[PDB]
Amino acid sequence: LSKLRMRFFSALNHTSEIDLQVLFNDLKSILTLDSIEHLKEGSVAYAIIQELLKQDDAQNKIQSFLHGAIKNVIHPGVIKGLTPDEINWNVAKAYPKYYEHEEFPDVTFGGFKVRDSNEFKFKTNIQTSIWFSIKPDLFMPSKQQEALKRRREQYPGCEIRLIYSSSLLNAEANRQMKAFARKQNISLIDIDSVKTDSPLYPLLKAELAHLGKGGNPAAASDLCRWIPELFNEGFYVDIDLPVDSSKIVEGHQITGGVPIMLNMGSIISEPIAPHHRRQEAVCMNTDIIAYSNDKRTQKMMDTVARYLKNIYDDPYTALKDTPLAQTAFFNKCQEERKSIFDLRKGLQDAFRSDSLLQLYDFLGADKFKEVFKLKEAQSKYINEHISEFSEKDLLLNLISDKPSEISQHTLDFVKAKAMYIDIAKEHYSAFYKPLVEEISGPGAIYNALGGAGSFTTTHRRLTGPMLPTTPPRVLQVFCDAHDKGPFVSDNIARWQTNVRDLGVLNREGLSWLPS
Ligand SMILES: O=c1ccn([C@@H]2O[C@H](COP(=O)(O)OP(=O)(O)O)[C@@H](O)[C@H]2O)c(=O)[nH]1
Ligand SMILES: OC[C@H]1O[C@@H](O)[C@H](O)[C@@H](O)[C@@H]1O
Ligand SMILES: [Mn+2]
């Protein structure tokens, strides 16, 4: 009985406003150590009990409350793999007069109205990762190999699947991949051989075929995540994500309110005048995705795939608000209907050119003026004469708005050029990253899922136990694969991060940005 009794008394705060021993005696039949966690302070049950304590007939009312709550809500919840938050909502919903609350709101996520029924089930012990190599002689770098060996030990008995492309590897590298998979007991999937009707399949093959000419392996990996033949159960996880073994659950099953969950969090803004309202914006990432065994997973997946397909048919709209949209190069590509690959390749080429003239032609008058912080007169002059400039003409007009005043006989032109090229190159990654993120990645996915702004919301202070009564709370409780799954990611903010506390994200990430 014995320390269960002692846990029970502690959970109920050793109150003598009722007799706990007598209560325990009538509950000893259904009480378990697991259900006690859901009775402690911070729980809905606890709060309900504190209110019953202040009314007549507390002994009896509490006993019937507890017996029903445990038998019908908490115990079945624990066995299903429900979280403490999901259990709390189920108790409040089952006892609406003991615990008054707002309605569960209508929230659309990927075309699905989010449900509070816990009906979607997910396996946490099946995990799929992706590695497409850009070096034909290296099947996978050591970092990622060691991540995989480590995952085997932090999550024993998990099924690891690995997607790769044999066409990217030479004979020997391919043999080494297969040998690595044999040694690690990994299920190896060759994307080259996958049979699918997905519209994403030729796009991912094109990304891989364009490596070295504007393709990107993270983009190909992004696309794989939304093909039903590859993902219909378990989790997708970025290959080097660690497992927090304390987050592993007994049955290796969790539930959600939608058929596909992923990594979510949120940022709360500072209070804005005049009403001091703070705003909560939900963040999302695709480094952790959980797919339900339910067949409705295929419908959500096809909604996303169609959105992605539309983006590849016309990337210029998806990119309209990114930094690259401000450049003459971007406008030129758009007018010429260049592919996303020609767009990425032109950017990379501009930045290895070493030419200030080529840089100007790439950026265009306005972006050039802002990059180099030029005065209006200096910018107008350049724009008006650049059609007859040498590299030296341009460099002199960058150094001074009175090129004549400059003692060229003391100037180091090589150093000066390098300096200006350098300033421009600090912009490369802000130009490039969106060419993946807004195309196949989390920016495109966030839009495909209704996102975002549909969930943006205005923020309210929590008073008691958290409940899914506002859109962000519905997402947190029912649609987030991060907190309830076994993996941990530093890519985006965790839930309800005050903006001042954001910190640096993805400290050691970004393997996919070409040098
Ligand atoms: O050379 C590469 C680089 C990246 N990736 C894929 O792209 C994913 C994301 O890479 P990373 O975690 O570095 O991106 P981040 O999460 O830091 O934005 C990896 O998990 C792989 O699936 C790949 O296949 N080959
Ligand atoms: O889309 C490019 C990358 O974006 C990152 O934020 C995700 O963590 C990666 O999984 C993804 O490949
Ligand atoms: Mn990552």
- Which residue's alpha carbon is at the smallest distance from atom 10 of ligand 2? 287
- How were these coordinates obtained? X-ray
Assess contact for 477 and 466: CB atoms under 8 A: yes
Largest Cα span, the chain: 99
Ligand nearest the Cα of residue 488 is: 3
Could you tell me if 131 and 248 lie in one domain? yes
Would you tell me how many other CB atoms lie within 10 Å of the CB of residue 319? 22
Domain boundary (386, 420, 437) is at 437
Same structural domain, 144 and 204:
yes
> Tell me, what DSSP letter sits at residue 247?
G
508 Cα to the center of ligand 3, angstroms? 9
- Residue ending a domain, among 80, 104, 128, is 104
Cα(285) to ligand 2 centroid in Å equals 7
- Examine the domain organization and report whether 47 and 172 are in the same domain: no
Report in angstroms the alpha-carbon separations of 485 from 121, 233, 242, 276, 361. Answer: 12, 14, 11, 35, 49
Three-class SS of 457-488: EECCCCCCCCCCCCHHHHHHHHCEHHHHCCEC
Closest atom of ligand 2 relative to the 221 alpha carbon: 12
Which residue type sits at 413? F
Instruction: Looking at the CA of 132, name the nearest ligand.
Output: 1
Q: Is 512 labelled a binding residue?
A: yes
DSSP at 243: B
For residue 29, give the amino acid letter: S
Q: How far is the CA of 167 from the centre of ligand 2 (A)?
A: 23
In the chain, the amino acid numbered 498 is: N
Report d(CA 249, CA 158) in Å as an integer: 12
Strands (E) in 353-450, as ranges, are: none
User: Domain containing 30 — which CATH number?
Assistant: 1.10.1740.130
* Ligand sitting nearest the alpha carbon of 239: 1
Cis previous bond, 434, omega within 30: no
Half-sphere exposure of 456 (CA within 13 A, CB side): 7
506 labelled binding-site residue: yes
Specify the pairing of strand 112-113 against strand 279-291: unpaired
Among candidate residues 360, 327, 329, the one with its CA nearest the CA of residue 345: 329
CB burial class (10 A; 0-12, 13-18, 19+) of residue 361?
middle
* Joined tokens for residue 24: 């325990």
Query: How many domains, the chain?
Result: 3
The answer to whether the CB of 12 falls within 8 A of the CB of 39 is yes
Q: Are residues 119 and 201 in the same domain?
A: yes
β-bridge mates for residue 126, sequence order: 159
**Integer Cα distance of 349 and 339 in angstroms:** 15
Using an 8 Å Cβ cutoff, are 127 and 242 in contact? no
Residue 131 assigned to a binding site: yes
Residues 356 and 487 in one domain: no
From the CA of 488, how far away is ligand 2's center (Å)? 15
Could you tell me the distance, in angstroms and rounded to a whole number, from the CA of residue 145 to the centre of ligand 3? 15
Kindly report the number of other CB atoms within 10 A of residue 34's CB atom: 13
Ligand positioned closest to the Cα atom of 446: 2
From the alpha carbon of 132, which atom of ligand 1 is closest?
24
In this structure, the dihedral spanned by the alpha carbons of residues 390, 392, 394 and 396, taken in order and rounded to 10 degrees, is: -150
Report the Cα–Cα distance between both ends of the chain, in Å, rounded: 64
Residues 6+ apart with CB under 8 A from 190: 164, 165, 166
The annotation status of 89 as a binding-site residue, yes or no, is: no
Give Cβ neighbours of residue 117 (< 8 Å, ≥ 6 apart): 257
How many whole angstroms separate alpha carbon 357 and alpha carbon 350? 10
Given a contact cutoff of 8 angstroms between Cβ atoms, the answer to whether 286 and 441 are in contact is yes
Residue type, 105: P
- Angle among Cα 243, 249, 253 to the nearest 5 degrees reads 105
357 belongs to an annotated ligand binding site = no
Kindly state the tokens that stand for 233: 């159960």
Pick the closest to residue 136 from 191, 174, 188 (CA basis): 174
The residues, ordered by sequence, that sit 6+ positions from 482 with a Cβ below 8 Å of its Cβ are 262, 263, 264, 265, 288, 488, 489, 494
Residue 238 assigned to a binding site = yes
Q: Is 239 a known ligand-binding residue?
A: yes
With H, G, I as helix, E, B as strand and everything else as coil, classify residue 285. Answer: strand
Residue 222 CA, closest ligand 2 atom number: 12
CA distance 448 to 410: 57
Is 432:347 a contact under the CB 8 Å cutoff? yes
Can you tell me which residue has the tokens 């100007």? 360
CA distances from 297 to 111, 233, 261, 270, 439 (A): 12, 9, 10, 37, 22
Question: Is 87 found in the same domain as 111?
Answer: no
Cβ neighbour number for residue 72 with a 10 Å cutoff: 13
Shared-domain flag, residues 353 and 397: yes
Give the C-alpha separation, 476 to 85, whole Å: 9
| Ligand 1 pocket residues where CB is under 6 Å | 130-132, 134, 217-218, 221, 238-239, 287, 491, 506, 509-512
Query: 347: Cβ–Cβ under 8 A, 6 or more apart, which residues?
Result: 324, 329, 428, 431, 432, 435
CA of 277 to the centre of ligand 3 (A): 34
Spatial neighbors of 304 by CB under 8 A, at least 6 apart, are 110, 226, 445, 448, 449
CATH number of the domain that 398 lies in? 1.20.120.990
- 482 lies in the same domain as 450: yes
> How far apart are the C-alpha atoms of 210 and 471, rounded to whole Å?
40
C-alpha–C-alpha distance, residues 104 and 118, integer Å = 14
CA distance 66 to 3: 19
129, 131, 143, 162: which to mutate for ligand 1, most atoms within 8 A of CB? 131
Q: Which is nearest to 226 in space by CA: 305, 161, 296?
A: 305
| Alpha carbon distance 274, 252 (integer Å) | 49
Same-domain pairing of 350 and 457: no
Cis peptide before 274 (omega within 30 of 0): yes
Q: Which atom of ligand 2 is nearest to the CA of 489?
A: 8
In sequence order, the 6+-apart residues with CB closer than 8 A to the CB of 439 are: 219, 311, 312, 315, 318, 319, 340
What residue type is 71 in one-letter code? Answer: K
Q: What residue numbers bound the domain in which 183 lies?
A: 105-313+438-515
For 106, counting Cβ atoms within 10 Å of its Cβ (0-12 exposed, 13-18 middle, 19+ buried), the class is: exposed
Q: Which of 51, 74, 104 is the last residue of a domain?
A: 104
Instruction: Identify which of 207, 285, 289 to mutate to test ligand 2's pocket (most ligand atoms within 8 A of the CB).
Output: 285
Please list every protein residue whose CB sits less than 6 Å from any atom of ligand 2: 218, 221-222, 238, 285-287, 436-437, 440-442, 491
- Let me know whether 158 and 278 are in one domain: yes
Cα separation of 124 and 254, whole Å?
7
Shortest-distance Cα residue to atom 3 of ligand 2: 441
**Residue 1 sits in the same domain as residue 21:** yes
Same domain, 232 and 110: yes
How far are the Cα atoms of 112, 113, 421, 440, 475 from residue 106, in angstroms, in the given order? 10, 6, 52, 28, 11
Chain-centre distance for alpha carbon 330: 27
- Paired with 121 in beta bridges are 255
